[PDB]
Symmetry: D2
Subunit: 116 residues, 4 copies
């Protein structure tokens, strides 16, 4: 996995399960092109989004569907989603973990970037 997404629920102290995630890549015409998508597992993690070959240099947007998550639990949250936008692989291939910690009116997001 060059790209992994991990989501935690700060209300429950648990992984955030079945959270939809959409990844986009900025295209040559400056539009966001769909890149990959999936749902977090029972561990809060989403693996297998992409491959080293496919995950070329670019500007990527990871959209985490936080509103849907909260609504399914009976909470009416503030944000529509969490968007994480970043340049990847500009100095060669890296491994990226995009973590998000969710509360109904607040979230944090962190990147952990390692060189394989």
């Amino acid at each position: 996995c060059p790209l992994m997404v991990k989501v935690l629920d700060a209300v429950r102290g648990s992984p955030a399960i079945n959270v939809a995630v959409h990844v986009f890549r900025k295209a040559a015409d400056d539009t966001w092109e769909p890149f990959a998508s999936g749902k977090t597992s029972e561990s809060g993690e989403l693996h297998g989004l992409t491959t080293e070959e496919e995950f070329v240099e670019g500007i990527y947007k990871v959209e985490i569907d936080t509103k849907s998550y909260w609504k399914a639990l009976g909470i009416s949250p503030f944000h529509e989603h969490a968007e994480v936008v970043f340049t990847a692989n500009d100095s060669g291939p890296r491994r990226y973990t995009i973590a998000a910690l969710l509360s109904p009116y607040s979230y944090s997001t962190t990147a952990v970037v390692t060189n394989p």
Copy 2:
């Protein structure tokens, strides 16, 4: 003042000064239309973005130019910017503060929604 933005620097323990902030409103054709913008003050705050009359219900995006902020400090950042996307809802009287706490590889954002 129905909408205020406040930005903090977690590395220096200080307000984040002179940070560019752009607000957008979602248009009927589903595109993001410029709405308001400014730069944070010495206190890390951006006031005067809008008025009660203009700030109607809808979907808004607040984009905080974090990357330029870090680059001005000589510190290599991860994110292109921080994006905060939410629905403004009339539910009796409301003031929205969008707070952001910035680190080079991490940020949090919180909505503080109060009735004057």
Copy 3:
């Protein structure tokens, strides 16, 4: 006002009101001596803790009674309290704001240190 405390509720998106806060100073015998205390206001803030004359260099602990706050909302929390431990340092003129952002299973704290 050299020392202020501000507390936010990430679940409700609001100031955290009526939160007990105790400040301690480390004594020569290495024990924590009561220094100041109060309850956060409607704005989530606790002012008037100390004066410039009393707030001498030393090691301080700010204890925020998070557990009682959550229990008053009916929400089961993880932490007994949030503890913020730091050295006050004279380095020209300084004001310290100790900010805390609370969720049931998570909190952040930030120091905003400014020169008036």
Copy 4:
């Protein structure tokens, strides 16, 4: 592992390596008794602190030596340490992950609690 500690560096976007961690348990005389200690690995993780048998009900304090971490990297940080205080195993054995995300003037801490 009934108790694991994970620490990340928000400046570098990397695990926080070789961070000292001390765990205490509140004794019958209301003093903090040493329970376990160790250092984070290359992954930012500290495993093997305790066993299910040893990790009885109680009030525990996890002290993360953040000041030492930052100073070894040439940063003069705000906090002395991060202290995480909580009741454990009050409704039976659980698995606890105590995570901390560090910046020089700010940290967040989260607990992930699972039932084996």
